[PDB]
Amino acid sequence: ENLYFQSMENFNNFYILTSKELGRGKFAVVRQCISKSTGQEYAAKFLKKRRRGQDCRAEILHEIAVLELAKSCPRVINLHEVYENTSEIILILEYAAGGEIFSLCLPELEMVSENDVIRLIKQILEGVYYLHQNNIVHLDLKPQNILLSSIYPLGDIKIVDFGMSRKIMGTPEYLAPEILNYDPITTATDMWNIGIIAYMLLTHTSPFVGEDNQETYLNISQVNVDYSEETFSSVSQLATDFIQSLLVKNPEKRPTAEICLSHSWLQQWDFENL
Ligand SMILES: O=c1c(O)c(-c2ccc(O)c(O)c2)oc2cc(O)cc(O)c12
């Protein structure tokens, strides 16, 4: 096999990897690296080219094409450089030190105000609007796949993990009903996932997970979500409406990202302004 991207010798001449492993999946690992010249931190994602007996370089190229298309959108993580060796394609990615928005959805962490959730969702919607305007549907917008540039203080959103992206069977609890019914790919699926993200940020509970997958699937297909006074006692009606407008069975009835940006819940004046 003939290599396309810059050589590994170059990678090691230009970067040093740190002891901080950032993430690992079955066919990928992400590690922090540092430019030897500048000292700037990046995230190096090593994607295996062979998976499950299938040559996946074409798919990796598609993922690079997407990150490149969205370079001008600061809500999508930016690709800095690319290297390649025998088994791997290595993405040198903008570093986001704040971790996953998932971290903010756990009981443990409380430090996330309505102001913060409103801004994060708005930034998420800006990134998705941009993607959709370009006929890109992420298709994997779990809270794990949106990072923050900082948490001390709370920074800005960076959508990552475009491996499932497409033009207009993963982790069960975040699959949209249309995916469970083998309907085609719609931009509406991302909007369902933004419903789940708002629900998780605000309740710190997962909206559809059951005691097992079969129940998880029953909850998604029936759109059986907990809106009891107990779970929603500290959640605002406006936030409730936003969520309830996204989490509906029929994808055609979900508002677009554009319309979501005009939702009353997100209209705020910064009090510092005249
Ligand atoms: O974990 C990370 C991750 O997966 C990705 C990523 C981005 C785009 C892709 O298309 C992709 O496959 C992966 O970027 C990152 C950037 C960071 O600064 C820190 C990270 O931890 C990740």
Side-chain angles (χ1 to χ4, degrees), residues 1-25 27-58 60-107 110 112-168 170-229 231-248 250-251 253-273:
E1 185 196 39
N2 304 118
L3 304 184
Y4 296 160
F5 298 103
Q6 303 232 123
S7 76
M8 196 68 184
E9 177 190 332
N10 277 5
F11 171 77
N12 290 300
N13 180 37
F14 296 141
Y15 301 90
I16 192 160
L17 284 159
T18 68
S19 64
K20 196 172 203 268
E21 188 175 284
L22 287 174
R24 191 171 276 273
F27 311 105
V29 57
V30 183
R31 191 172 280 277
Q32 179 188 52
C33 62
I34 295 174
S35 175
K36 295 200 193 170
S37 321
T38 55
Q40 176 65 244
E41 298 161 318
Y42 298 93
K45 183 154 168 37
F46 297 72
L47 298 157
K48 286 300 171 189
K49 285 176 280 181
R50 287 284 290 180
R51 298 175 197 200
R52 327 183 174 79
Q54 305 182 319
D55 181 343
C56 291
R57 187 201 227 168
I60 287 160
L61 284 161
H62 177 76
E63 187 175 339
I64 292 163
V66 175
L67 291 169
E68 182 75 9
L69 176 37
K71 69 198 276 194
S72 63
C73 174
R75 311 296 183 231
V76 180
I77 198 74
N78 271 41
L79 181 56
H80 182 243
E81 282 195 328
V82 185
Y83 299 78
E84 182 173 7
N85 62 38
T86 291
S87 65
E88 288 159 358
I89 287 170
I90 307 167
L91 302 182
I92 308 307
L93 299 147
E94 170 184 12
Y95 192 69
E100 298 168 353
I101 62 100
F102 186 56
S103 311
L104 304 174
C105 306
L106 300 159
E110 190 190 309
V112 180
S113 62
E114 197 171 31
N115 283 357
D116 298 327
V117 176
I118 285 166
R119 174 176 68 79
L120 300 170
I121 289 305
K122 186 176 171 158
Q123 295 192 354
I124 294 173
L125 287 162
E126 298 166 347
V128 173
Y129 169 83
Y130 176 92
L131 291 179
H132 295 177
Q133 285 295 121
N134 290 269
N135 304 306
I136 307 155
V137 284
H138 190 278
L139 294 177
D140 199 18
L141 284 170
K142 11 179 178 158
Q144 288 80 351
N145 293 341
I146 304 181
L147 305 187
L148 297 160
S149 74
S150 171
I151 39 162
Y152 297 128
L154 197 72
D156 307 317
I157 248 74
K158 301 292 174 160
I159 294 166
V160 296
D161 286 358
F162 289 77
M164 310 282 263
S165 279
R166 290 178 110 252
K167 305 303 185 170
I168 294 166
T171 309
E173 81 203 68
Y174 300 106
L175 296 186
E178 60 267 26
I179 296 169
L180 299 171
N181 252 67
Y182 301 80
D183 294 347
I185 309 87
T186 162
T187 60
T189 301
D190 286 343
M191 304 304 309
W192 170 272
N193 284 118
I194 288 176
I196 291 181
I197 295 169
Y199 184 104
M200 295 181 67
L201 285 161
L202 290 165
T203 75
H204 330 287
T205 54
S206 153
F208 297 108
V209 84
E211 272 278 316
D212 65 6
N213 287 338
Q214 183 194 322
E215 182 171 26
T216 301
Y217 297 140
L218 285 176
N219 288 325
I220 296 162
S221 50
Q222 298 166 341
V223 198
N224 187 283
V225 183
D226 167 30
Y227 295 118
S228 69
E229 53 166 299
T231 306
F232 280 69
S233 69
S234 63
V235 181
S236 76
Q237 188 60 46
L238 286 174
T240 308
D241 298 326
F242 173 93
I243 296 174
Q244 288 172 337
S245 71
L246 290 166
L247 301 179
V248 307
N250 184 348
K253 297 304 174 64
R254 294 176 210 146
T256 55
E258 184 151 28
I259 288 158
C260 276
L261 282 163
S262 283
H263 193 286
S264 285
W265 182 41
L266 307 180
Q267 310 314 299
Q268 224 182 46
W269 197 249
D270 207 65
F271 93 97
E272 304 281 351
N273 297 323

